[PDB]
Amino acid sequence: KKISQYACQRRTTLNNYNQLFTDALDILAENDELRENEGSCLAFMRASSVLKSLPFPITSMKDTEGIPCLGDKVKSIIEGIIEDGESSEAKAVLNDERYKSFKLFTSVFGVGLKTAEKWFRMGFRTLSKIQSDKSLRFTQMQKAGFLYYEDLVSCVNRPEAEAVSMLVKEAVVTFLPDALVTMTGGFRRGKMTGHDVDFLITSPEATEDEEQQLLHKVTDFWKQQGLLLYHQYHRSVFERSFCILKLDHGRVHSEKEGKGWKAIRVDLVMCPYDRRAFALLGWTGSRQFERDLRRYATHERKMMLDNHALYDRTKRVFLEAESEEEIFAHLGLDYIEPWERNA
Secondary structure (H helix, E strand, C coil): CCCCCCHHHCCECCCCCCHHHHHHHHHHHHHHHHCCCHHHHHHHHHHHHHHHCCCCCCCCHHHHCCCCCCCHHHHHHHHHHHHHCCCHHHHHHHHCHHHHHHHHHCCCCCCCHHHHHHHHHCCCCCHHHHHHCCCCCCCHHHHHHHHCHHHHHCCEEHHHHHHHHHHHHHHHHHHCCCCEEEECHHHHCCCCEECCEEEEEECCCCCHHHHHHHHHHHHHHHHHHCCEEEEEEECCCCEEEEEEEEEEHHHCCCCCCCCCEEEEEEEEEECCHHHHHHHHHHHHCCHHHHHHHHHHHHHHHCEEECCCCEEECCCCEECCCCCHHHHHHHHCCCCCCHHHECC
């Protein structure tokens, strides 16, 4: 069996035998991303992704034979790690001032690349200086990011994601009692931690007006309960909401006070019932698994896959699916479980 270049033709569990290589490659991809070197970034991400799927650790350069997405630049990074136990290249990025600042500024909710470049070019290097500056002005998203900084930079754990899950279902069934709530993202793929909790909401019986208003009702309901700390909606091409919820500690059933609550990033997506298999596939990730799913669909099958449909260009028909298994089968792909999509 020859290893495929597509992550959607590989099984990638959270058991990484090559973390010494993939951690170095992820730093190198992140660096390029923060410099807007998209091509160099995507190239590092594909190499990192293929090594995460390996059932054994690389111990020599010979172990690298037959593996796709392993260019000449990437091979020199691999050899360097085999020789020293560390990547001088990734260590350089870790010591780079632009990398250090961009990673720190974008760690604030509301801060993207244009805001992080602006602050860096003003001579700012710490959040303390940003926050106390009397001339800087911030967006409502950034103020929330600064206000709940420590809680948001703290990992969201599985008991917390479940405590959030209960709050989402309770709020949703108040307006659409037949609605299906599904936890997506890294938590669906078996991750222990995340930076946020994602949910997909859908209703068999709901009308166009009912699905358009549900996220507004859910948030108004949390606002009346005093649980909403921040919210931002985004029109349909799905109805989305990006919140910051107040999560009381008494709601968290873990093995483990000083302020009995934690601010949690929650993302909600409402989708029409007949597009649910596509939305679940699209919102489960990982990001590399999606990119390869769409790349394989286009290059191999002459099909167009997105978050709401699968179109066959040869047959001139949209392909229907009531499940992710049906989408895989239409793509001519063996089914890959959510826990094998950690590409």
